[PDB]
Amino acid sequence: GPLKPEEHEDILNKLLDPELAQSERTEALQQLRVNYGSFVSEYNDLTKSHNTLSKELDNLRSRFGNLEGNTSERITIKNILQSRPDISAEECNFLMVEQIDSANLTTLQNTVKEIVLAVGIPYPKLRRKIPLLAIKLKYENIMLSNFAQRLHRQVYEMNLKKFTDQAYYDFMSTRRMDSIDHHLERCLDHLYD
Amino acid sequence: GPLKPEEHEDILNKLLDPELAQSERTEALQQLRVNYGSFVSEYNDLTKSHNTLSKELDNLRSRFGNLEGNTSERITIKNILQSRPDISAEECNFLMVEQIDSANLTTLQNTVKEIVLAVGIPYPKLRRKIPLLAIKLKYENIMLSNFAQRLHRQVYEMNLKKFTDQAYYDFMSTRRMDSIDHHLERCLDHLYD
């Protein structure tokens, strides 16, 4: 590559020499000439390499930025406690809310895909309908089961969770929600009369 | 900055001159000297700037890589149709599955946070329990409601969805799942006898 500072400087010192042969003067100037063209070329090649690298880093910051989305609107424990007075810090911890911040995009995508397929609600509507699912699950189901339960006790308690586990066994062997035969149905009709 | 190739070359041409004054020879060599130290300095400064940029791009590829996670295990429409014979392309489209691939990390995090708070299942357990939620919602609830419904008809049809909308109204004004008074409860006891 280009000459080190000390090699260049030696040439300049040679050239100062008053008794340098003419051929020697020309040669040394030629070495300076050749060298400088090479230094300039190395330099320009560095200049394009630095700029290509600046291009790539800029796209990688935008690309990164878009898939991260707006940091500002992340829901925190603090936000949750604030906007949902029924939820404690203890519940947040038990539910492992903060661990969702460790998940990568592929994992979250897959998770959400599975929720959408399970609950039968289009993705763009899902957040809006999350309260409706909380209500089905934590209230109506429990009150609906209770009513059947209270009546089943005065006719004889149903083993509702035996039913549930059977329907999960069925789904896992089939991989079809379609054609689960939920035994709850049968026993409810035996209670119908 | 450093001299252009053509400016450098002029100096070399001056130096060739046989009748150049001694003072003139020294001066021109000094210009060459000063210039080369500057070129070398500019160069080294570019060399560290290129490398700092290479550092930053490398971290930005790892940082990006970790939050994207493994591209290979993304669930596709093709995967879904394959592993769930009960689900069609039409259902995938209606559910807008593919649109989940457009969501950023903040959005997916927030969505999952809301599911976990709504269904009361810790995050690390959520995927594993998604089939159980599908069963509660698509089977037991419907069979449980049916039983109450069939009995309510032969005693007089309950307006179950009037109940649901009221509990959602209550939740939206309160922001507490806690203290929803679901009217379903009341009417079920009026059917109890």
Fold and architecture overview:
Two copies of one chain form a homodimer. Helices cover 73% and strands 0% of the residues of chain A. Chain A is built from eight helices and no strands. The longest helix of chain A has 47 residues, at 22-68. Chain A has one domain (1-193). In chain A, helix 1 packs antiparallel against helix 2. Chain A has helices at residues 5-16, 22-68, 77-83, 89-94, 105-119, 126-155, 160-174, 183-191. Chain A has 193 residues and is mainly α. The termini of chain A are far apart. Chains A and B meet through helix 1, helix 2, helix 5, helix 6 and helix 7 of A and helix 1, helix 2, helix 5, helix 6 and helix 7 of B. Chains A, B: It is found in: Cytoplasm, Cytoskeleton, Microtubule organizing center, Spindle pole body.
